[PDB]
Amino acid sequence: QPGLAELRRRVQEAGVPQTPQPLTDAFLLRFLRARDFDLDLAWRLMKNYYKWRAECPELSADLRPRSILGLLKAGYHGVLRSRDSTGSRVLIYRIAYWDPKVFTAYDVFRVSLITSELIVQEVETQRNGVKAIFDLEGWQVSHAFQITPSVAKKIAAVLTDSFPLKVRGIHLINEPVIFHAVFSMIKPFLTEKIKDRIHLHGNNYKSSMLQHFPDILPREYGGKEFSMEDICQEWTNFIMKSEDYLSSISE
Amino acid sequence: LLQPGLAELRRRVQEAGVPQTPQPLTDAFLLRFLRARDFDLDLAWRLMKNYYKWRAECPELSADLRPRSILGLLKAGYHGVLRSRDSTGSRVLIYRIAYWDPKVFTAYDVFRVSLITSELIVQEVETQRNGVKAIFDLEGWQVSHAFQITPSVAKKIAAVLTDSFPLKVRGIHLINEPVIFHAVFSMIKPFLTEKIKDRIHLHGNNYKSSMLQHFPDILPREYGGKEFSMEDICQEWTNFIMKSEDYLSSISE
Amino acid sequence: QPGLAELRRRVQEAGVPQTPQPLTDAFLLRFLRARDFDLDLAWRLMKNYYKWRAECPELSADLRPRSILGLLKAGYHGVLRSRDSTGSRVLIYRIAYWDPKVFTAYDVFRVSLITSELIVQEVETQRNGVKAIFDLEGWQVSHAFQITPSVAKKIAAVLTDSFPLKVRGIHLINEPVIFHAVFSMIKPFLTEKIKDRIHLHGNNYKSSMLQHFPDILPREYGGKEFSMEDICQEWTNFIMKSEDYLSSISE
Amino acid sequence: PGLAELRRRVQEAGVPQTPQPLTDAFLLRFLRARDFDLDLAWRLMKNYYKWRAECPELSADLRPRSILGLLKAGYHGVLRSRDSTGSRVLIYRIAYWDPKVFTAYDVFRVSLITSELIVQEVETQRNGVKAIFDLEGWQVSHAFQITPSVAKKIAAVLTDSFPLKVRGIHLINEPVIFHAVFSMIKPFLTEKIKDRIHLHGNNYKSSMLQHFPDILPREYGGKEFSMEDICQEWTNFIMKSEDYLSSISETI
Ligand SMILES: CCCC(=O)OC[C@H](COP(=O)(O)O[C@@H]1[C@H](O)[C@H](O)[C@@H](OP(=O)(O)O)[C@H](OP(=O)(O)O)[C@H]1O)OC(=O)CCC
Ligand SMILES: Cc1c(C)c2c(c(C)c1O)CC[C@@](C)(CCC[C@H](C)CCC[C@H](C)CCCC(C)C)O2
Ligand SMILES: Cc1c(C)c2c(c(C)c1O)CC[C@@](C)(CCC[C@H](C)CCC[C@H](C)CCCC(C)C)O2
Ligand SMILES: Cc1c(C)c2c(c(C)c1O)CC[C@@](C)(CCC[C@H](C)CCC[C@H](C)CCCC(C)C)O2
Ligand SMILES: Cc1c(C)c2c(c(C)c1O)CC[C@@](C)(CCC[C@H](C)CCC[C@H](C)CCCC(C)C)O2
């Protein structure tokens, strides 16, 4: 790979912490692939990733799952069994299974960080990226109370050059009108390729979702072969089985 | 062959001193109000007082009903009326925002097009009985349109729609509407009865099948019909307004 | 009094609820005094009041103060010891002391209903009305989340023709600049007189407020004699002392 | 040092060699704008040329004759003195922008012209600029000119597409709607960036005197000169620079 050992010379001569993430070839590949081996942006992303980590100890330091197990058990999150036509990983998040009384927005954010770290190891996921589907049915004001400006800036960074993962699609379903109306305002001021990656489907999402993701959705969203229950429990399994590797890369 | 409440309405009108010009207080004219409220005399009277109150408060809309000043808008293709009534007998009106040039015409000019049309169709007994449905195609909506809809204009649209014109409004259909219209609808909903809320329909960009449920076999080709085009009915309606200009003069101040 | 006899008769003819608030002459005089003994206006107000009460049982049914005692102890609300120069009762509300995670907009609205039911018993308050000062310092997006269009409609009603108290002044201090844009949207839907009774004073409110309320404000707002904390405590003690009277007029 | 590596990349990447000559002084604008951080300077340089190629209707022509009418009207002046930190201080008056005669692009070109003139000053490269926008007389016709397209260009030029450090943006007499929306945008900006944006409102005299003591025109609190003075002085400087501005413009 053009820049496999080349990039490590920038890593050594800068003084990047060797722990908790061992600076292996397997770890350094994440950053190059995440920018299509553009060595220049790969280095900015690596700096931004560790900058993001040093800025957020309450989030980035701890990847140990046992703390957000209740959320996974409640069925907040599952990853689809298959990749989409572009080979991207497809993730589903379900707002109605987040209890703001029990779990804070930072706990919920950790779930994405955990999943992101496990799937980023997959080569195809590095090349093809991820698409994320947010089912906003069950949105309460108590959820909104949790999304402070500080939380929103962290969502922003992690989706744009602060994590070694291409975001290839953000899909919202069952959003409140208020979400769609505000987004309508910010939409025209966004770049051309970015507003091609954000999709607000509303309540009548059936067919737009099938255009984007044929054959691979759970029954709840128009598919025919499995349910959210299945993939949630499956993904919950994968995370708890990987809890040791997750511990070994924590602080 | 006495009409319920007509004799008494004619007396209340006289005791209150309702303006005799520009529109004469014929039986035909009074009956507009009674029919709009299904012959409930008290409600027809409250309506009739509201109608004159609204007119007096908005003379920059209500005084001049002559079409000449708004001919450009009709020529552009802003407004047409369907040939057929819907299945409940309503007149069906179509307004197309994309043919309103806001550099050229103000919100008040556009509003006058609706007043002119309403004053013409309210002469029909079947329209008095069965009301109107209006379809707004909001494709091509611009910030220039939004800025013309000042809080003042919104109040006069609300005022005129709230018990101030003797036409029953049986349905409002918006198609191709920007998402913000939904937020605006949410803000106004608590001020509406369930009956009225259920008459307002925002269909979105994928409106064709939903709007065909309401208007089978009578829409122009552009909206899923197959017998005529929008252009045909804009021309025909424009024609009719121009032939009615002598009448429209006589009911102007 | 002009119209009391006719009102008594109308009350009887129309089947106005006799419970939980008994239809004494004193109660009927609230409606007459609120409308300067204009019978038709007083009758209209009375009907609007019962209409409002029936539309909003979540607000009107319960005037028991125990559920909102926490808000009163936090220092949300007090009433000035003196009337203003025109004989109006003067109320203070401090948004910083409403925790929207703990109290809903409906709980906060109920505080005003309780206070209003208490002060409307005063003949001078019926004659001279009220002024309310809202200190919006500490306003958060989370206070905004609770002000739905439904709540906005109830607020509008009670300030205009659905509650038998003349509103002689609404003063906002430390209000976010956004309130001015909201005020522009609302103005056409209000008459010249009511718009004239709404005052937004900003962060530098002290001299403009003193023009309206010389000598009577607490120290926090430019007066000299007492603190907000004193008047919150006094008003809390009074609301709780009145708890049986309040229970006696609750459904 | 950092200059040598930048020059290498410039030759390697095929950075356009015209209209502006790629001198050591030209490259130093980019190094100084990012305090000699080579990665940041090179990124800035790349963004600058990218911005020019996407916006040739703005970037190709810096000749001032097309916008002399706007200068003569009193739209724009530069303070005779730098501020206490050495920044160049620019004043824009929306009242004197007739949006029927000049587009937002015309008005934007004035700022491009002023910027290409002051970036030549070493102390300006080092200490950046402050800009004051007097929004008295803001009309709906101005807002119509500010499309999303224009908004994106303004954001780019203020952030990472022009080699001038923006040290402060001051708005005075702004309508409520600027303040209302900005208050919604405020919490999402960084701490450093938020401390560089200042909305003074209608009562601005004291707080403006704080940031710029003894250097402002009479109109904004000073005593030594008028806006009209510095408008005319700046207009005459721009026009005396018209050959220079041609030399850094593409051919016609
Ligand atoms: C300025 C934006 C106004 C706005 O969006 O305002 C909306 C929000 C939420 O308000 P709500 O009272 O919690 O919920 C509303 C009621 O359930 C209503 O009865 C229902 O309509 P219906 O089902 O009876 O027809 C509405 O459905 P939609 O119309 O959304 O689909 C629902 O929204 O408030 C704001 O977010 C407050 C914070 C600013
Ligand atoms: C690397 C990575 C992370 C870390 C990630 C996501 C993706 C696609 C990633 O690639 C998507 C979700 C997110 C940003 C976590 C969001 C946490 C919040 C608390 C979710 C709850 C509610 C939101 C109001 C829902 C809308 C979110 C979308 C607009 C992204 O975390
Ligand atoms: C008697 C009568 C009148 C007078 C009338 C209408 C109807 C159904 C009537 O029966 C509907 C249209 C309206 C209110 C005129 C509207 C004029 C404005 C300027 C149109 C442009 C833009 C609107 C923001 C689009 C949507 C409006 C709907 C929500 C009504 O005039
Ligand atoms: C009889 C009566 C009631 C019942 C009353 C008030 C007055 C003057 C009355 O005379 C004023 C306050 C109000 C309308 C309750 C307000 C409840 C809300 C939830 C307060 C919080 C936030 C408001 C967005 C702050 C601004 C309020 C003013 C614009 C009124 O309750
Ligand atoms: C290199 C450079 C350029 C090129 C520049 C500015 C500055 C400080 C620069 O360093 C400031 C102004 C701007 C961005 C051009 C503005 C053009 C528009 C059409 C002005 C009119 C109206 C604005 C909506 C007023 C407020 C703008 C502030 C929010 C910046 O051009």
UniProtKB/Swiss-Prot annotation, chain B:
Changing K195A: Loss of tocopherol secretion (in vivo). No effect on tocopherol binding and intermembrane transfer (in vitro). A 1,2-diacyl-sn-glycero-3-phospho-(1D-myo-inositol-3,4-bisphosphate) binds at D163, K168, V169, R170, K195, R199. A 1,2-diacyl-sn-glycero-3-phospho-(1D-myo-inositol-4,5-bisphosphate) binds at S186, M187, I188, K189. One of its GO terms (biological process) is response to toxic substance. Binds (+)-alpha-tocopherol, enhances its transfer between separate membranes, and stimulates its release from liver cells. Binds both phosphatidylinositol 3,4-bisphosphate and phosphatidylinositol 4,5-bisphosphate; the resulting conformation change is important for the release of the bound alpha-tocopherol. This is Alpha-tocopherol transfer protein. Coiled coil: none annotated. Changing R37W: Abolishes binding to phosphatidylinositol 3,4-bisphosphate and phosphatidylinositol 4,5-bisphosphate. It comes from the Eukaryota. Residues 66-231 form the CRAL-TRIO domain. It is found in: Cytoplasm. InterPro entries: CRAL-TRIO_dom, CRAL-TRIO_dom_sf, CRAL/TRIO_N_dom, CRAL/TRIO_N_dom_sf. GO terms for cellular component: cytoplasm. Pfam families: CRAL_TRIO, CRAL_TRIO_N. Monomer and homotetramer. Phosphatidylinositol 4,5-bisphosphate binding induces the formation of homotetramers. Phosphatidylinositol 3,4-bisphosphate is less efficient in inducing tetramerization. Keywords: Cytoplasm, Lipid-binding, Transport. (+)-alpha-tocopherol binds at F165. GO terms for molecular function: lipid transfer activity; phosphatidylinositol-3,4-bisphosphate binding; phosphatidylinositol-4,5-bisphosphate binding; vitamin E binding. Changing R199W: Loss of tocopherol secretion (in vivo). No effect on tocopherol binding and intermembrane transfer (in vitro).
